[PDB]
Amino acid sequence: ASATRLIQGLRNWASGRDLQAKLQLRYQEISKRTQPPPKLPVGPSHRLSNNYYCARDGRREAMPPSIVMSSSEKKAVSPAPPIKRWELSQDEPYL
Amino acid sequence: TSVKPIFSRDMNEAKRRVRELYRAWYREVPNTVHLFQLDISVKQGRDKVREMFKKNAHVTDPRVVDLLVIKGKMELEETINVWKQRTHVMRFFHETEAPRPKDFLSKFYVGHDP
Amino acid sequence: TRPTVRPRNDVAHKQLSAFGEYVAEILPKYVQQVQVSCFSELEICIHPDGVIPVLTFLRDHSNAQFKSLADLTAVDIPTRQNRFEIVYNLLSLRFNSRIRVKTYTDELTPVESSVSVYKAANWYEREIWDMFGVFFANHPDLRRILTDYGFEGHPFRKDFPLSGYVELRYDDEVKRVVAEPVELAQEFRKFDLNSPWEAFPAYRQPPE
Amino acid sequence: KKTTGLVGLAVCETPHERLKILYTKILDVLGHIPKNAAYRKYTEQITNEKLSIVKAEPDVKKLEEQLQGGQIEEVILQAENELSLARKMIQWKPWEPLVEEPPASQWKWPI
Amino acid sequence: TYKYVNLREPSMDMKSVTDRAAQTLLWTELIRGLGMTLSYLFREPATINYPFEKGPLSPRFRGEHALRRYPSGEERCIACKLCEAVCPAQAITIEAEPRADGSRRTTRYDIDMTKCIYCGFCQEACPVDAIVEGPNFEFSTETHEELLYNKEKLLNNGDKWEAEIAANIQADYLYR
Amino acid sequence: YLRVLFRANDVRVGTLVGEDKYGNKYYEDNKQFFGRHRWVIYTTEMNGKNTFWDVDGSMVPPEWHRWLHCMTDDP
Amino acid sequence: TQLITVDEKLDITTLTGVPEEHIKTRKARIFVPARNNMQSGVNNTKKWKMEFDTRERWENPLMGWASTADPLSNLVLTFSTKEDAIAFAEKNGWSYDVEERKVPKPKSKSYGANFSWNKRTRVSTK
Amino acid sequence: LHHAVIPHGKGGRSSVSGIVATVFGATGFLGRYLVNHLGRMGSQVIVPYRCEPYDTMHLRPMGDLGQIIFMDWNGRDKDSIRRAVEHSNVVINLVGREWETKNFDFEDVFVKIPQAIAQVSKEAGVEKFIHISHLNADIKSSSKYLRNKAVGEKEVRETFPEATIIKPADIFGREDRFLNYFANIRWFSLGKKTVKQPVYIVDVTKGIINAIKDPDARGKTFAFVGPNRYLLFDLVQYVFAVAHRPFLPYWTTRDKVERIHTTDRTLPHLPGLEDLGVQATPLELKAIEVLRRHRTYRWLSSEIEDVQPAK
Amino acid sequence: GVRTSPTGEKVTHTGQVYDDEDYRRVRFVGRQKEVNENFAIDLIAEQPVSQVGSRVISCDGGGGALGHPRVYINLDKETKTGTCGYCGLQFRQQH
Amino acid sequence: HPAAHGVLRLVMELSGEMVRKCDPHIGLLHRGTEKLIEYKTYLQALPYFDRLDYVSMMCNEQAYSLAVEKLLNIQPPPRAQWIRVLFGEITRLLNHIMAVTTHALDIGAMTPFFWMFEEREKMFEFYERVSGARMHAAYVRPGGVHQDLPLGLMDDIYEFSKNFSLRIDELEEMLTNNRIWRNRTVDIGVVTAEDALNYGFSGVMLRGSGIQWDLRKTQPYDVYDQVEFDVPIGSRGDCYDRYLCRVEEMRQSIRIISQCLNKMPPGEIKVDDAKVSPPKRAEMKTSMESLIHHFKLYTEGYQVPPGATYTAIEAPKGEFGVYLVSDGSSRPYRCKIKAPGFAHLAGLDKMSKGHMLADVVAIIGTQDIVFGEVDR
Numbered sequence A: 001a002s003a004t005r006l007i008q009g010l011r012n013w014a015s016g017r018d019l020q021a022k023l024q025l026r027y028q029e030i031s032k033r034t035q036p037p038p039k040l041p042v043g044p045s046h047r048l049s050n051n052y053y054c055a056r057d058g059r060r061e062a063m064p065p066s067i068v069m070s071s072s073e074k075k076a077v078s079p080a081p082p083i084k085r086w087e088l089s090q091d092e093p094y095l
Numbered sequence B: 001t002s003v004k005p006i007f008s009r010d011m012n013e014a015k016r017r018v019r020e021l022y023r024a025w026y027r028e029v030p031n032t033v034h035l036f037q038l039d040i041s042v043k044q045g046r047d048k049v050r051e052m053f054k055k056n057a058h059v060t061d062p063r064v065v066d067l068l069v070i071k072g073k074m075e076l077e078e079t080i081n082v083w084k085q086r087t088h089v090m091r092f093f094h095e096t097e098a099p100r101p102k103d104f105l106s107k108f109y110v111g112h113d114p
Numbered sequence C: 001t002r003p004t005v006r007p008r009n010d011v012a013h014k015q016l017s018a019f020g021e022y023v024a025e026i027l028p029k030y031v032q033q034v035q036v037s038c039f040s041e042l043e044i045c046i047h048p049d050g051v052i053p054v055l056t057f058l059r060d061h062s063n064a065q066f067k068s069l070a071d072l073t074a075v076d077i078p079t080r081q082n083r084f085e086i087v088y089n090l091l092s093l094r095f096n097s098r099i100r101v102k103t104y105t106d107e108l109t110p111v112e113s114s115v116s117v118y119k120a121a122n123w124y125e126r127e128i129w130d131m132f133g134v135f136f137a138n139h140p141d142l143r144r145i146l147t148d149y150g151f152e153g154h155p156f157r158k159d160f161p162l163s164g165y166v167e168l169r170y171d172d173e174v175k176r177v178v179a180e181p182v183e184l185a186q187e188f189r190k191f192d193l194n195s196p197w198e199a200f201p202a203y204r205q206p207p208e
Numbered sequence D: 001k002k003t004t005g006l007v008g009l010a011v012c013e014t015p016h017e018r019l020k021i022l023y024t025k026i027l028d029v030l031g032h033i034p035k036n037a038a039y040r041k042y043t044e045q046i047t048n049e050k051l052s053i054v055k056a057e058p059d060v061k062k063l064e065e066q067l068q069g070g071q072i073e074e075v076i077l078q079a080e081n082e083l084s085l086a087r088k089m090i091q092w093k094p095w096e097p098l099v100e101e102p103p104a105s106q107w108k109w110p111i
Numbered sequence E: 001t002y003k004y005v006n007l008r009e010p011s012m013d014m015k016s017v018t019d020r021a022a023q024t025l026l027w028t029e030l031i032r033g034l035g036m037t038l039s040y041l042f043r044e045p046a047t048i049n050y051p052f053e054k055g056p057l058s059p060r061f062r063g064e065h066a067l068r069r070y071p072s073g074e075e076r077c078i079a080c081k082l083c084e085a086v087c088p089a090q091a092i093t094i095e096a097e098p099r100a101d102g103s104r105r106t107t108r109y110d111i112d113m114t115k116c117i118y119c120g121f122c123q124e125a126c127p128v129d130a131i132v133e134g135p136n137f138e139f140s141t142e143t144h145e146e147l148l149y150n151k152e153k154l155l156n157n158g159d160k161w162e163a164e165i166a167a168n169i170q171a172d173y174l175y176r
Numbered sequence F: 001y002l003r004v005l006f007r008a009n010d011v012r013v014g015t016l017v018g019e020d021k022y023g024n025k026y027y028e029d030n031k032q033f034f035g036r037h038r039w040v041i042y043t044t045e046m047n048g049k050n051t052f053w054d055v056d057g058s059m060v061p062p063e064w065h066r067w068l069h070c071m072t073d074d075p
Numbered sequence G: 001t002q003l004i005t006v007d008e009k010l011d012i013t014t015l016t017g018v019p020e021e022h023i024k025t026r027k028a029r030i031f032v033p034a035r036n037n038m039q040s041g042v043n044n045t046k047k048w049k050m051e052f053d054t055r056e057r058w059e060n061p062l063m064g065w066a067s068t069a070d071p072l073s074n075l076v077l078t079f080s081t082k083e084d085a086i087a088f089a090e091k092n093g094w095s096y097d098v099e100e101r102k103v104p105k106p107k108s109k110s111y112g113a114n115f116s117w118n119k120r121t122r123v124s125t126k
Numbered sequence H: 001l002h003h004a005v006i007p008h009g010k011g012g013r014s015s016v017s018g019i020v021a022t023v024f025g026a027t028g029f030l031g032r033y034l035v036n037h038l039g040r041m042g043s044q045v046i047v048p049y050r051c052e053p054y055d056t057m058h059l060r061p062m063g064d065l066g067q068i069i070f071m072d073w074n075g076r077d078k079d080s081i082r083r084a085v086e087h088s089n090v091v092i093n094l095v096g097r098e099w100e101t102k103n104f105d106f107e108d109v110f111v112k113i114p115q116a117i118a119q120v121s122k123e124a125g126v127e128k129f130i131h132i133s134h135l136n137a138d139i140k141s142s143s144k145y146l147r148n149k150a151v152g153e154k155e156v157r158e159t160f161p162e163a164t165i166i167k168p169a170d171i172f173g174r175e176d177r178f179l180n181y182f183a184n185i186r187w188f189s190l191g192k193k194t195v196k197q198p199v200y201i202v203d204v205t206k207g208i209i210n211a212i213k214d215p216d217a218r219g220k221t222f223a224f225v226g227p228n229r230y231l232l233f234d235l236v237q238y239v240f241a242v243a244h245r246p247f248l249p250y251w252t253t254r255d256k257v258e259r260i261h262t263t264d265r266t267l268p269h270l271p272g273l274e275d276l277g278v279q280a281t282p283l284e285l286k287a288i289e290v291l292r293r294h295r296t297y298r299w300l301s302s303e304i305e306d307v308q309p310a311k
Numbered sequence I: 001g002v003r004t005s006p007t008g009e010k011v012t013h014t015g016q017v018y019d020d021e022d023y024r025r026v027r028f029v030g031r032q033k034e035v036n037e038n039f040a041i042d043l044i045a046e047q048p049v050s051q052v053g054s055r056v057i058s059c060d061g062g063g064g065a066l067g068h069p070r071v072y073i074n075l076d077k078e079t080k081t082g083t084c085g086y087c088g089l090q091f092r093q094q095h
Numbered sequence J: 001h002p003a004a005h006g007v008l009r010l011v012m013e014l015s016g017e018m019v020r021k022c023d024p025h026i027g028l029l030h031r032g033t034e035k036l037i038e039y040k041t042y043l044q045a046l047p048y049f050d051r052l053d054y055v056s057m058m059c060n061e062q063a064y065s066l067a068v069e070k071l072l073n074i075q076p077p078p079r080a081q082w083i084r085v086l087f088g089e090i091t092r093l094l095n096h097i098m099a100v101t102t103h104a105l106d107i108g109a110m111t112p113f114f115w116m117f118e119e120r121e122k123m124f125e126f127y128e129r130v131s132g133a134r135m136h137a138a139y140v141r142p143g144g145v146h147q148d149l150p151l152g153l154m155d156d157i158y159e160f161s162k163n164f165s166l167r168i169d170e171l172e173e174m175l176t177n178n179r180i181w182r183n184r185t186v187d188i189g190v191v192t193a194e195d196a197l198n199y200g201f202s203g204v205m206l207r208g209s210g211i212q213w214d215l216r217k218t219q220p221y222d223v224y225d226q227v228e229f230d231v232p233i234g235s236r237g238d239c240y241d242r243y244l245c246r247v248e249e250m251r252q253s254i255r256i257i258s259q260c261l262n263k264m265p266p267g268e269i270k271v272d273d274a275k276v277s278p279p280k281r282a283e284m285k286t287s288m289e290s291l292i293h294h295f296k297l298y299t300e301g302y303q304v305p306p307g308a309t310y311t312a313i314e315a316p317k318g319e320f321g322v323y324l325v326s327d328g329s330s331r332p333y334r335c336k337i338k339a340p341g342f343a344h345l346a347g348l349d350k351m352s353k354g355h356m357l358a359d360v361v362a363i364i365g366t367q368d369i370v371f372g373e374v375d376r
């Protein structure tokens, strides 16, 4: 912006990237500071009459660790389903 | 309470190991005091070595004697290497006093303390 | 319920339940506790004589691959007859799974140095040697990592205080750095932050 | 083929027959194991079931498909590792009773 | 979903192999690299000019550790020690006495600018917004003694500007 | 011109936004980028330091200090 | 593997490397902290605290701060039993004193005992 | 006494000692090691400097957080010295330049300085004023230097009579003056028979800090002599033998050569090192300390290659 | 309004002023003992004590969360002008 | 030394410019974070996880807050989740571009340093306008994002997205078929897959050699089910190809930012529970319960159920592990950090078996070791 056009031609002749259009010298793109202030919404809370904390008590639903052994068999289980093999890309994979 | 051992089955191999480590620390001191370019006579160094061995005189458990031997052999690894510095080997010496007394009287004038 | 509360899973819960009972069935010599939390990560609690058998079984056997390793920090706990907890954290590659192997130990009895079965275990084992002092028999290399050389005392124990005993400064009397006993310029005011009135009712141990 | 997907790994020209003789040696070394350990039961069950997956598949890519744990040579290396633990598990007799007690009040957390 | 790299091969056509040879000889795309660098050469640079053209900031920035007061009023702090109770390196030393009326106050309110770490937790914890982060960041002290602020240093620091801090909080009170 | 010549680098007078007690001047350009919007010109002998040379930060009054760090758009 | 085992207690007081002044002179106290009196509720019971003694804390001449020549006064150790407290004190080496866990004495009370005919317990105001 | 002068706790790194020191000089050698032992001792050290602030930055990290403090002074005013000793427990007079400038002779330094500071110190109500000086101060000739220090001792015993005048003999240390003068002989040596008895600097300042913390120190002048008492030619043999530089024996005033060829005599009229109760260390190991500069990689590392007798 | 100290120096708003045997006087060499002229006692007294003819009033100090939280104070006694704990100022009632 | 990226003692016991042994003596940056977090509470010891890593300033915070919330059974509302995803990708972008930059400094290559640090100055401007921090935004409390993003910020993110896509195409223009940089680094740091497993490497290494593993695509620790991307895989290994994997993770991070700006719902900031996060200001001034929860929450810290838990995120290094052990308390009993930088430091011997010292420099610089995190 506001540079002589022959040196801009030497810029885009030095590298074919169209250096003028996206040049990373941002002039006035950032909006005006001290904006209109926001009225912050509040989500699923202080809706009256059913905000019993016993319902959404994630602190009092921690459970102690359940135990198995201490100090005709369709079995030999794995810890998980065997994980499905992935799939190639779409937008220009190789190949 | 049969604890699994470290190296030995009684204290005799522990005595053998600690005297072998003392042999090694005897022959390794003048190499260091020639190598780190210190300012200390050799006999002063050897005598503080045997003082640091005599500091732990009351130790009787075999695992613990083995673990002291492992500590001393690790530091002799660090002094056959030059991985340590001049500061650490002078820090084994106690030369910047610290002249802190042992009498009751001087600990009374400089007090709030037994 | 639906908002603000993390919805627990059941598929991985039942699967790790069955898998823990599977391991408990197939190695009865070295199983003491199998346990599952509410968020379903497996814990297997182990006497320290079958550490190498359990690890050689868990890296292999093809019912559970478990290639990848994470640290074993023996979290420093008094009041127990055997103090420390070696905590393996195994992370598989074919299964997307997380198991933990808590074997126990104490201050002098060595454990069998898992470096020979996991090459990753070497610097973690040297770290736990330098910071706690659990000596590792049948091990190639035990140096001290992440401390000073001339320092000792194994500072992560509960017995070692928050600030150290030694303190380094410079002096021109011997033109070098020397060590001194510690002198703090401010007390570090500890805060009593332990509320009464039974913060969680489910976790009451049976009283004496 | 060409371009196996891993670095320090390259398939041989005969996957099938190497895989079969691997699993028959697994059945052998497992046959030396005593009967009462259910370890033998689980290993023999899953190994013969995986062999039976292999038996009816003269297609390389289809055997990669139906058998879980792809692609091909990871199964081979994993079976080699299973032979290594079987050779270790001649020793260590992991169906014996427990070694001696914990301190009986240990694994309670909240201390 | 995955997109792996260097699935490529040297194509065996003659124009392909002679272009790879010409790139082997003249270092042609090396000259392309030179051209890219010259394209950033004739680009206008983006610096500031420090004593004259300062760099930008944000309305929520964390500065000074100053103190406010009421409209023609008392010191806004009431010695409730929440700032020390959230202070992570304990750089808030508070010793309190009530004054000669019955109203409650302080004696000693020291912030260790060394030991501070500029969380903002003492901004978020102060119940009346009495301690506020300033805007400016220019301390730059030739001694170690003169980065330990006492109470009157803090209040003379907070009386060096308030309209500043009033503007930043007034433009920022709804957010936090 | 000698003053602005040996000041640092600029000749870009032509906006002339404001001035303040202590006498100092504040300019704001539109044409440059994000980083050369606004600048200051320090007057001399504001506390008699021969402050033509060796200028400090925080010679600015605080209201223009908020203005010059680009927190608002207006003086 | 079937070693010495015999009545020889543990001696880590040369392993752990704490200096001898802090080994010998420090007299620890093992006790149960009672309820914080101005509060109520005894959830802060059930934990055997080991504390050390207290030593000098002087006026920092530059700030009036609390500066001490103590490394150890910030310690507190939470135990569960009394036996293991005694065991840890003997194992690590330093001196120690013991105090009991003085329970409340359970009394019998009644609102129907507040109200009576010929017993003098009578609040006369409820 | 005012509070917060009372001692507190284990000494070292902000333990408030019972002393607030005011040290004249301290930019050079002896005052620097004295400030070093006071900062280890943990006092509050007022020090004036009349010089560039780089040497006062040099002695900055010696004391603890804010325990030292600096000011400016001269040999020409009275307000600065009075402001120095406004609030001073103890005050020591170290001053003296080895060579005359074009403004300050060896006359009027030891006349204008100690009279002025002694007078304003006695009028300021200090305790335990300690003035240093040299041994073998004679009223007679052959040393402008030593006769001016003799007149200095006369003035400081004249006014404020319960002071403490301390003389050592010549001192050798980690940055010694005279052995570092024996450095310069290497590029060129003079040998005569004269006895000499050096003393190492850190036990000198140990005796100084014991005598500055302990009363009975006032009035009685003290003399600090090491245990050596040997000959000049043996010292020259010893230093060129420790340095391993080959030699053939035959910033400098002639007052320097008059000092090192005067004499060194004894005085049993006054106590010394161990009568005050401080250890004295011999020459040889500190010589191995201080001769590391001159060797240059030929016989750079050696300890016990040479012993030289006393007398 | 600062007072007069005996040492030719300034007092502070809290009476911690020096003595004639002090070392911090000689750490005040050539540099300002800083002090604020603004005193908290000497501004509150120069406020008009407001009069609100109700019984129990609110206090915020002005502005929404730009001041201290709500406090409801009593205005029954006439022997004492009713004082907010946060606002630092007094009140009365009329009738 | 500057090629010793950060501070790193390296005892190399070589044969002359063609080695014999390398010894990574680390520990010089040892600080005591684990001891300090024993003696504090959760909300207070959060900036130790700000300051543990010192490039990925937000993802490790995400890891710690996810450890606490996976312990505590709380799901934050989804606007906080999408903002957490957004800053995860932005900070991952910053970390990968510094990895490319400091490897360029080690290898020579003085200019992409300056270019991409102008871009990273724009990044720090974003952190300035978000949290009032230049480099260490706490900003991620257990309870989610605190003090949400202000008005007129998504404009800046959008403009940065477009310009940065152009700038990273220009970095591929600059390097990447540069003959001298390519043939400088081809066949160094070969890592077989067996060794890549058993040496405990994680993340960028395991992508960069062989195995097809991804923490994001295989374990949703966030709202990553709805976003669509693809992770690059290295297949030679050949450290050049690992570099290419880092470049394509950067451009895929731009894609995830594009989807995230498409799918931002205007829900909320914090959770619906004043016994976990402190309430806002109007409630803090009026409501009694808000004041009580505020005051007791900033004194004691909230009580926490007991548990020995672990989680891990996809750090720009890799499998970043955090292992909490929590007493029934408001204090963590022992936290622990598994650093992928430490794991990658472990295999330095096998990376430098048969090479020369410039290869040692390129191998230390080619994996994003930082040693503020490698130390624990």
Ligand SMILES: NC(=O)C1=CN([C@@H]2O[C@H](COP(=O)(O)OP(=O)(O)OC[C@H]3O[C@@H](n4cnc5c(N)ncnc54)[C@H](OP(=O)(O)O)[C@@H]3O)[C@@H](O)[C@H]2O)C=CC1
Residues within 6 Å of the ligand: H024, H025, H026, H027, H028, H029, H030, H031, H050, H051, H055, H074, H075, H093, H094, H095, H096, H097, H098, H104, H109, H132, H133, H134, H135, H167, H168, H169, H170, H171, H177
């Ligand atoms: N054996 C003995 O008893 C001997 C003792 N000494 C004493 O040892 C101490 C250390 O020796 P040395 O290093 O040479 O001495 P000093 O470093 O103490 O030199 C005197 C100090 O006072 C300052 N000073 C000197 N002349 C003037 C003046 N005209 N006006 C103002 N300030 C002045 C100097 O300032 P600056 O350097 O900053 O310019 C210097 O810091 C001295 O006190 C000296 O008297 C010395 C020789 C023999």
Ligand code: SF4
Residues within 6 Å of the ligand: E076, E077, E078, E079, E080, E081, E082, E083, E084, E094, E125, E126, E127, E128, E130, E131
């Ligand atoms: S939080 Fe605010 S009101 Fe409370 S003591 Fe601190 S500064 Fe004072």
Ligand code: SF4
Residues within 6 Å of the ligand: E083, E086, E087, E088, E089, E090, E091, E092, E111, E115, E116, E117, E118, E119, E120, E121, E122, E123
């Ligand atoms: S910002 Fe500074 S003073 Fe405030 S709480 Fe944090 S460390 Fe403490």
Ligand SMILES: [Zn+2]
Residues within 6 Å of the ligand: I059, I060, I061, I068, I071, I084, I085, I086, I087, I088
């Ligand atoms: Zn009010």
